[PDB]
Paper text:
To ascertain if this is a conserved mechanism among FBI-GS-GlnR complexes and to elucidate, in detail, the molecular mechanism by which low G + C Gram-positive FBI-GS proteins bind GlnR, we utilized single-particle cryo-electron microscopy (cryo-EM) and solved high-resolution structures of the Bs (1.96 Å), Lm (2.61 Å), Pp (2.07-2.28 Å), and Sa (2.15 Å) FBI-GS-GlnR C-tail complexes. Notably, the Bs and Lm GS proteins in the complexes were all tetradecameric, while the Pp GS in the complex formed 10% tetradecamers and 90% dodecamers and the GS in the Sa FBI-GS-GlnR structure was all dodecameric. Peptide density was evident for 8-10 residues of the GlnR C-tails from Pp (IQGELSRF), Sa (PINRGDLSRF), and Bs (FRQGDMSRF), and 5 GlnR C-terminal residues (QLPRF), in the Lm complex. These GlnR C-tails all form a distorted helix and bind within the GS active sites. Thus, the GlnR binding site within the GS active site is positioned at the nexus of the double-ring oligomerization region. Residues making contacts are labeled and different GS subunits are denoted as GSI, GSII, and GSIII, underscoring that three GS subunits participate in GlnR contacts.
In Gram-positive bacteria, nitrogen homeostasis is controlled by an operon encoding glutamine synthetase (GS), a dodecameric machine that assimilates ammonium into glutamine, and the GlnR repressor. The structures show FBI-GS binds the GlnR C-terminal domain within its active-site cavity, juxtaposing two GlnR monomers to form a DNA-binding-competent GlnR dimer.
Numbering used by the authors:
A (entry chain I), B (entry chain M), C (entry chain A), D (entry chain U), E (entry chain D): 2 to 11
F (entry chain Q), G (entry chain B), H (entry chain W): 2 to 442
Amino acid sequence: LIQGELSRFF
Amino acid sequence: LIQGELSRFF
Amino acid sequence: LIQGELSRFF
Amino acid sequence: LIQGELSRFF
Amino acid sequence: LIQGELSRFF
Amino acid sequence: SYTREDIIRIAEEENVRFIRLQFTDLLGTIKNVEIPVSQLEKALDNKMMFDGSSIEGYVRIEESDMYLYPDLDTWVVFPWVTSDRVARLICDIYKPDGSPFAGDPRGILKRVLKEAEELGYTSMNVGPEPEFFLFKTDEKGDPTTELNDQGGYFDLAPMDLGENCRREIVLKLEEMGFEIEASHHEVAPGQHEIDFKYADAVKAADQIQTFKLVVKTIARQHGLHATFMPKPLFGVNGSGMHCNQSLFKDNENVFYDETDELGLSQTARHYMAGILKHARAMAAITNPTVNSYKRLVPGYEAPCYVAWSASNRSPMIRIPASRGLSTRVEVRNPDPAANPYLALAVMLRAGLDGIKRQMALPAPIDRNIYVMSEEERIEEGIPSLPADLKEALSELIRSEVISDALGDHALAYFYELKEIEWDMYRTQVHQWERDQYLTLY
Amino acid sequence: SYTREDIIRIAEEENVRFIRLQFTDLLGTIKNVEIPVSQLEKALDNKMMFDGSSIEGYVRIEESDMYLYPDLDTWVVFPWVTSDRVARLICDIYKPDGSPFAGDPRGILKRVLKEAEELGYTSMNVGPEPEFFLFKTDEKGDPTTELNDQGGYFDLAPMDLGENCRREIVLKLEEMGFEIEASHHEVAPGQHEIDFKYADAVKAADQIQTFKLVVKTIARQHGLHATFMPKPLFGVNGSGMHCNQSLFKDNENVFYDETDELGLSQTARHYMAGILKHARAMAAITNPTVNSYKRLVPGYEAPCYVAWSASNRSPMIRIPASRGLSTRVEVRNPDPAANPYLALAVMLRAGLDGIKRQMALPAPIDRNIYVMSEEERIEEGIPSLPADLKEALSELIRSEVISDALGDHALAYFYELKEIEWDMYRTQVHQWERDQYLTLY
Amino acid sequence: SYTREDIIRIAEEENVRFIRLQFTDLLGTIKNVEIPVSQLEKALDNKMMFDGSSIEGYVRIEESDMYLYPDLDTWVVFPWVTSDRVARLICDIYKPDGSPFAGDPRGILKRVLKEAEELGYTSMNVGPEPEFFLFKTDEKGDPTTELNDQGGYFDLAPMDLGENCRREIVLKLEEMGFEIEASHHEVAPGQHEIDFKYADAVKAADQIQTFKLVVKTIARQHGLHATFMPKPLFGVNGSGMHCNQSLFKDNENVFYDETDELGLSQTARHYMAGILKHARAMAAITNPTVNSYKRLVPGYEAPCYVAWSASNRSPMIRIPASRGLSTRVEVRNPDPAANPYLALAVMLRAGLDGIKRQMALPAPIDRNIYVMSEEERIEEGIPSLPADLKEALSELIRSEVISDALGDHALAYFYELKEIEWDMYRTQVHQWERDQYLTLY
Ligand SMILES: NC(=O)CC[C@H](N)C(=O)O
Ligand SMILES: NC(=O)CC[C@H](N)C(=O)O
Ligand SMILES: NC(=O)CC[C@H](N)C(=O)O
Ligand SMILES: [Mg+2]
Ligand SMILES: [Mg+2]
Ligand SMILES: [Mg+2]
Ligand SMILES: [Mg+2]
Ligand SMILES: [Mg+2]
Ligand SMILES: [Mg+2]
């Protein structure tokens, strides 16, 4: 559900 | 109606 | 569970 | 025990 | 004493 | 025909060292298990075990064990003008208990042919018309945007010997034992079409698979890239896989009728009516990719509406002028990306349903073409093909006739594969959006 | 089989001018001593002396002197289609006093097989499934990040003759005398798998070594780079070395039981129980590199938990559907980077310990897969494989069963090598750290 | 000190047009809400509402609403020598019902200071020693691998005005109202250290945050990149954040004792004993990043073992030679990447636990340094700091003393953040693995 916040790893 | 045949001009 | 098969999209 | 000070040679 | 063999890491 | 002794004799005589146990998955990709000639006898005893979940594509969940049952009549030796010859065998998939695998497309087509035979039709005669594009490659071997030539419809553009892939493809296919009817340059630049002679449905699908493999191999041999993608370029003609079909009953064409004005029997008309009624349901199979529906746009001879005619710009179904034992019903929706076995199975099942239910054939579309409004279109009862993959998937799910042709096991996995593909496609941000927006907004 | 006279006769007849006295070190790297054919008779008298400390790897501290004892049954001539033929012999290492060297992995495997024979089991039947990656090379000959192809599971991607390494590898292996079962394209792009026919454990490990050498040689010959690294790329499938095993007693498969529901005898169940109990202890041997535990991550079919099943996404132990004399226990932890002799020795020793102690087989994991929480996982008694090399090293040190299989001399040197490797790895600052930090902090 | 009227008067007089409502999240990143001067009065009434879930970092699940309560004593105007002055206020986070937010690190430190005051200690005197690296930038503004200079320990390398960041940083800090003790060049090339004068714990942490912001701003202004990453480069010294601490009771240093041989009171010794006992538990807070444990390696003056001394290469706790009212206990584990509020809170809580339980101080380590074996190390009872982030996380979870200091709400979110970070890090394939393997295997 939390994909937009984990963009720092991508 | 004839568009795919007139591709020589494009 | 299926990540190694979906490598075509990545 | 002194590696970080000898960095001038590396 | 073993420096010539550990050259794979350097 | 062939037997075990014949295969062993030919392999020993031809110095065959490599055997490809070729089969097909649900997506239509060509799959095989390599084999040294020392295992040929074990292969012929139907004793080779492989995964079998590879049929399911990228939605496979667990490893299974399945057996390969080679079909001796499909034996052929590739003429790659090199030592250590390579041969192939097309195999059916069987469970370890001995029952055939329900998810094998070849088995699905065989089951549909069996239920057709139960109605008194001995064979389904199919002749396809696959078209493909030829692209240039770079120093790294990747395809570029440059076509191999700039020829037109029925042109003689790729002449001489320099990068003449079409001639070499036909020559190698004839050397293999293919029955090639004719070939010509297609409408778009770099597009080519090779037409096979007519054969039974299973043989026709096997020939389509072998033809795709041979075309790709020979194109790569000449420093070119061959693609069967339905619409590789915007604004140019797409690639179709029109399939001419006719039912037979002991070498008698049941589609023929001398007394008919158009030379079409009542059985043939029922067949076309059944195909027309279930068109939107089979669209997900005959046009399985996202790019398949970029081809189904007006102005490029691809069919966009469900209607039949003897002469039109782009009808759903066309009736060729040939008569007698060559009277055929040509279905023009399928693209070469479609699975041949599944597409033939669903088309045959729709035709059989129309025959059994004695469906009424709608009136053909006259020289009048589709500049008419939507109100005029649905006033005359002219349906339209699905606009994208999602609509076709929904129609396939809601359909009970062709879903039964697919079977319970294969339908679920095909639906999962196509849903994953559509979900991946729909969330992408394309360059067109960045060109239109990002400056206006 | 072969004799001294047979070897001399073949070498004279085949015009062999170069002989490789091939052996293996603790890390699994292929080692050999070159020999002109004029020294073949001296080599066959077990009189060649070499260092021997090269077995210990980069932790050797003094030069020793050891003798090479060739195995005549391992004689083979490489088919490199060139004059001045090259042959090989696989040799055991012996101390100058005549006793075998304790640090030779082949001797370790032989000792474990001997203590298995002392229990009444005549042979260990082993068939491995090595997978490898093919990478493109640059002008300087170094591997790049580009794969040789973009095929999928069981695809026919490397067709024709252009850079078709898989076909050439199988052909050359068959010419050498290899018994190849089948080969196919693997899940990841550029990944290939070749499966051998089953043989005894020592022959199986020798075949694994020869297969790695042949694959690397043929791949280099085609301007490609072959690697058996467990996880060369993040986000794609890794390479495994699943080993199918079955104990035999005078050509009788003791793992078979017709009365059993799954066709598994009590001895087989004890064997799997013993392997499962000691899994974390042998993880340091079957997964010896730091990169080996980057493969043991969920979502790529590699096993991450110690459990067995007949059908699962990625179990520790899988029981194939084949029965009768082909009933096997497949262990899927080992990667191709593992030492074949050591891995087979530790697996056999764990199985023998389970058989001797009559260990109870835990229940198999059902279709339920590992979305369960850690509390649910250890409530059901499902252990996990070590997360990195350090945990596996600690488990190996604390283990008394497989450390005895390794032996006192080999265990210390293997532990020293792996400790040095982990110490070098753990102090490095990787590009991922500089990407995450150095701007946030 | 300041009041609402004083803030309004200064803002009107100084022509302040921008106010930064600065706060901190759990990861220590500096967060703020911009505000025009027309909203200053509304801000001073504690009526600004923002998300508040931004404190939880990238593991926030739902949007909340929280109020900002500025601290008037933290008011300062940035001296950026430009019109339209910019000011800042440091705010505490409050729930809409009026209660303080449990996840605010400043509130956590305030609660720990309150429970210290309940024991009779009026203040915690803290002086940090933050070190940072200066890197050159490219044309695109991204940091390169080149350092700003090649100076050594206490060198005068960055002289003149040419990119003299250290001098500028000190000057701007002094203009802001910072109490700077001294600054010097650090051991590694491109490394710099600025030491502040001692202040209360909350003021010390606010000063650390402001110092990091000012250093980054000034370094960027000179075409350089400032980083507080613990170990940016392998083989060179890392960056530490040694924190000198001493408890006070009405301007009386309770750590001082003239009668003691080392000038350390019993309360001070209990404090150090409590810090030493809980070291591995607070390691997850004082060393929160993956890169933090690449610094904790021998040979670079960073502490790797839990032991105290007055003179050693790298002890966990060092007692400076200063005595009287300047007697201090220096804790050297924390790196500048650590959250200042959380690190100070956990250190103070461990010291308070040691004081309350009257813990016994272990003997100091003599001139003997850590070439001793592991058996000698645990025979003398010398623990070691966690080797990586996972061990520290496990120790933090199992710890009841410092987990209570963190609080129930903050502990879960910090654990989730660090678990996600470790999971992302552990599955990566680094260039070191490809260098070691991919050719050997
Ligand atoms: N002239 C033709 O028949 C071309 C047909 C067209 N390429 C299609 O995709 O249907
Ligand atoms: N489909 C497969 O069996 C691939 C196995 C996978 N490559 C592994 O490392 O285990
Ligand atoms: N104080 C020094 O000499 C430097 C300390 C070292 N940079 C550390 O990380 O602790
Ligand atoms: Mg055509
Ligand atoms: Mg046609
Ligand atoms: Mg495999
Ligand atoms: Mg396997
Ligand atoms: Mg310092
Ligand atoms: Mg200090």
